[PDB]
Design a protein around this nucleic acid. Structure first.
Lengths: 165, 225, 129, 205, 156
RNA sequence: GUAAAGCGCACGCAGGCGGUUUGUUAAGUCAGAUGUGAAAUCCCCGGGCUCAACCUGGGAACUGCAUCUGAUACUGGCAAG
């Protein structure tokens, strides 16, 4: 349930969503898993003041935990910077929120009315010349230059997986 | 979807007296019978249809609709409409800054919820009689005000309104935030704040009901889709 | 008394634009007609229509793009009180070229750019933006 | 006609390293480069709009070692000339003979270069030029004369330069001790930290 | 990414039975160095709080401005209350030639090159508003083309 | 309108401005040319004093005035409506 590389030590606090109490010998004990996207989602909910008041809505939160993450959010018709409000001063929300995950590489991303734009805005940070998504079998096909492709793919397809997810 | 004949039967075509009109409603007016303004059903119907379509579309993307009507004649009906399509509503007085000042009103909602829980799920009873009474009163107050919107969570993605002049505060709020507005707008009302104006009789009960029902149906359809 | 007809026409147009009037009618004159034509060419109005024999009425049909009016500004420059004549080098550029300046030249009334192209200046009637 | 005082003080005042000392020893070791000069150094309240501009102007002036009237004249010239004003000004500044020499690497500091120029060490197209403000043109070869070629300081300067990045707009020969001013530098070739625009604004009061 | 400049801060008083209650008004303006600008006017008993409020205000209700490269698209007048403002597009290198509150708004907006005079009143709050208005009204060539039913080459 | 500022109200000479159509004129207006608008100064590209100031070659400019030849939409004159 923990990170692969991030090793905890005593004196370090950890916040997580607990999900099970399995009855062991001589009574049960609490168990958590501080690696889900629920953890970063609630962390940004406790972080952003516009998240509670419905000025902006969190459309999708996608995380490869500890490694790399991309969440797409939009403003609920206020002409408001969702990345600027969910970022704080100089990243001072999300770079603090990444400290909740233990070093997450998180990207707040834009989203628009039509789903096509959302998918095109979920390919950041990478430009997209054209996108041919299949209307039948959910198989959006994005096409651009090699330079953007590398950034649109990432290490083990993180960006692709994130966007796809 | 909704026919012209039905509308006529309801009393949509009737408007307010000529001295109380707004000249911004001059396009939607047809004529004046017995010194009372008649709304043009030829211009109304298509607009209404369009509005309905829009609503349906909104529903389809899991949009939150808010039904506003604080006339007190059609308070019962609007609530019913809301509940049929399991959507939210404000059938009693609109709290000034319900949407613009959501974050404060979110606290109120929470409080109300807590009160409800105390009333129902706790089953504790054993409370000082005056205090208990006070609590009950508070609960009643909350229910009346924020009963429909308690499960709304955030802000709505569209706003259906039964009277534009009466609910101008709501409309204004929706404009400031940019929420789409779907107002029923009689001849006395102002259509400028409204996005999807519906020229029709706000006052008559049957007409109001008709307006509600179709909308509800469309929302349901959207949900189904 | 009525002293400047072109000016009056311009004013009328402006008022129409303000008040969201579809079409604006006025008593016709040749110069006025020419101006209207020019405007149409430059795309600030939809169409103009003169009608009548004894006392004909010019009717312009105003244009509205995305709610708001097309004729953002429209000022007389020459006026009976104080006439303005420009030489082809001194001809203005309204809104840094985005607007037009109606200028009456020896070869008829035309936009400023047109006049420049021709190689001639004249009486500057109005700026339109 | 020259600033003869403490050089590092100026740098401190500015905030940045102005390159007023050779660069053998790092500036942080020689002085408290972060702390401003004088009794009230540690205190640092945010400056005014005018003040920032003034500071910027000073920085540039300090860097090249140009007094105010001269600077003003240069600015005026730039304004007169076609193209971007600040850029033009920068180019003009660069064009100074002493500056060019420094760039080449015959002077450790700009001051040193200036001194050399003064003392009839440098030639421009085989003619001894003594003026530090002399605007060196494109394709104008500039060299150390045979008398001053034996000096140990010159070689040291060259060495220092070699450690320092080479400018693209020149071409210098260490053995021959002659450099060709190939072209007037582009803005991209110069340092990005200099806000020329502020300077321009200051004089456009 | 957003840059934010506190233009002015002013102490304002309210007389009460006891004496004078003082407070502070902060006028700020924020922009992304492109078209987007927004001013905010915040008020509080202490300065920093007021400033913060102003900033918050600014960050919502922004406005877009069509910018031809670093400068404006054509000379534009903007008025609001006493402050009437003229601003004129200018060649690369010239810098923001403008005074006070007006300058700040321009800078955030990401205009680099302007010639701008503030006639009339120079009351910061009004003048910034005026500037904003001017920016807002200013139409682009493309926009004008769209309006008029023409191509961009027809307009030049 | 309330900040300084609408004659107390009219008639009315001089003056200013003048609905609409056609014709004509070509005064205003515009175009081109010619003559002139001293040199220096200013500005542009150059050259010479080591650089600069300074000196200096050529240009541009001197927004005007006069005359000649056109243009005639607009303003004016004259003639008819």
């Amino acid at each position: 349930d923990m990170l692969p590389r991030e090793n905890f030590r005593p004196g370090d606090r950890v916040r997580g969503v607990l999900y099970s109490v399995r009855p062991e010998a001589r009574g049960a004990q609490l168990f958590v898993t501080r690696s889900k996207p629920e953890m970063l989602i609630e962390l940004f909910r406790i972080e952003v003041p516009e998240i509670g008041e419905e000025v902006i809505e969190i459309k999708a939160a996608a995380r490869d935990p500890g490694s790399r993450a991309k969440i797409a959010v939009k403003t609920n018709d206020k002409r408001i910077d969702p990345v600027g409000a969910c970022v704080g001063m100089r990243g001072a929300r999300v770079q603090a929120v990444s400290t909740e995950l233990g070093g997450e590489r998180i990207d707040i991303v834009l989203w628009d009315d039509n789903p096509a734009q959302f998918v095109i805005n979920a390919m950041a940070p990478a430009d997209v010349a054209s996108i041919v998504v299949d209307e039948d079998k959910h198989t959006m096909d994005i096409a651009v230059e090699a330079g953007n492709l590398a950034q649109a793919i990432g290490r083990n397809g993180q960006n692709v997986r994130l966007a796809s997810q | 979807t909704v026919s012209m004949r039905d509308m006529l039967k309801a009393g949509v075509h009737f408007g307010h007296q000529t001295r109380y009109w707004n000249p911004k409603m001059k396009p939607f007016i047809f004529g004046a019978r017995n010194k009372v303004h008649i709304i043009n059903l030829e211009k109304t119907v298509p607009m209404f249809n369009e509005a309905l379509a829009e609503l349906n579309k909104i529903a389809s993307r899991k949009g939150k609709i808010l039904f506003v009507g604080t006339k007190r004649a059609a308070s019962e009906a609007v609530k019913d409409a809301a509940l049929s399509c399991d959507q939210f509503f404000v059938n009693h007085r609109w709290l000034g800054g319900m949407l613009t000042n959501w974050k404060t009103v979110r606290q109120s909602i929470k409080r109300l919820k807590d009160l409800e829980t105390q009333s129902q799920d706790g089953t504790f009873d054993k409370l000082t009689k005056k205090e208990a009474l006070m609590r009950t009163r508070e609960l009643e107050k909350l229910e009346n005000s924020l009963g429909g919107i308690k499960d709304m969570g955030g802000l709505p993605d569209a706003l259906f309104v039964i009277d534009a002049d009466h609910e101008h505060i709501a409309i204004k709020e929706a404009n400031n935030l940019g929420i789409p507005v779907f107002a029923i707008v009689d001849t006395n009302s102002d259509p400028d704040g409204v996005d999807f104006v519906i020229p029709g009789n706000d006052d008559a009960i049957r007409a109001v009901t008709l307006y509600l029902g179709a909308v509800a149906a469309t929302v349901r359809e959207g949900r189904s889709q | 008394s009525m002293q400047d007809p072109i000016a009056d026409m311009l004013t009328r147009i402006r008022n129409g634009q303000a008040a969201n009037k579809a079409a604006v009618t006025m008593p016709s004159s040749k110069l006025k007609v020419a101006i209207a034509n020019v405007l149409k060419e430059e795309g600030f109005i939809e169409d103009f229509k003169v009608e009548g024999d004894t006392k004909p009425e010019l009717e312009l049909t105003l244009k509205y793009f995305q709610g708001k009016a097309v004729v953002e500004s429209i000022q007389r420059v020459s006026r009976p009180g104080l006439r303005i004549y420009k030489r082809k080098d001194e001809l203005p550029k309204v809104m840094a070229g985005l607007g037009i300046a109606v200028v009456s030249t020896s070869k008829g009334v035309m936009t400023d750019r047109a006049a420049r192209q021709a190689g001639l200046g004249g009486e500057i009637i109005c700026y339109v933006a | 006609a020259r600033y003869l005082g403490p050089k590092l003080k100026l740098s401190r005042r500015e905030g940045t390293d102005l390159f007023l000392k050779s660069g053998v020893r790092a500036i942080d070791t020689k002085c408290k480069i972060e702390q401003a000069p004088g009794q009230h150094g540690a205190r640092k309240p945010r400056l005014s709009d005018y003040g920032v501009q003034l500071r910027e102007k000073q920085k540039v002036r300090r860097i090249y070692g140009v007094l105010e009237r001269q600077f003003r004249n240069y600015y005026k010239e730039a304004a007169r000339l076609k193209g971007n004003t600040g850029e033009n000004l920068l180019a003009l500044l660069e064009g100074r003979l002493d500056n060019v020499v420094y760039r080449m690497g015959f002077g450790a500091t700009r001051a040193e270069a200036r001194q050399l120029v003064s003392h009839k060490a440098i030639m421009v197209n085989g003619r001894v030029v003594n003026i530090a403000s002399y605007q060196v043109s494109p394709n104008d070869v500039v060299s150390i004369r045979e008398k001053a070629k034996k000096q140990s300081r010159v070689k040291a300067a060259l060495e220092l330069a070699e450690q320092r990045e080479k400018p693209t707009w020149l071409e210098v020969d260490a053995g021959k001790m002659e450099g060709t001013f190939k072209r007037k530098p582009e803005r991209s070739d110069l340092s990005a930290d200099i806000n020329e625009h502020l300077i321009v604004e200051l004089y456009s009061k | 990414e957003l840059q934010e400049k506190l233009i002015a801060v002013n102490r304002v008083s309210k007389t009460v039975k006891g004496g004078r209650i003082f407070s502070f008004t902060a006028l700020t303006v924020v922009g992304d160095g492109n078209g987007r600008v927004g001013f905010g006017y915040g008020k509080a008993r202490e300065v920093p709080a007021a400033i913060q409020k102003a900033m918050e205000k600014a960050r919502r209700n922004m406005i877009n401005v069509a910018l031809n490269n670093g400068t404006l698209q054509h000379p534009v007048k903007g008025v609001h209350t006493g402050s009437r403002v003229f601003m004129q597009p200018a060649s690369e290198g010239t810098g923001i030639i403008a005074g006070g509150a007006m300058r700040a708004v321009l800078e955030v907006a990401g205009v680099h090159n302007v010639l701008a005079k503030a006639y009339g009143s120079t009351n910061p709050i009004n003048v910034v508003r005026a500037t904003i208005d001017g920016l807002e009204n200013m139409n682009s060539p493309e926009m004008v083309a769209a309006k008029r039913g023409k191509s961009v080459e027809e307009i030049l």
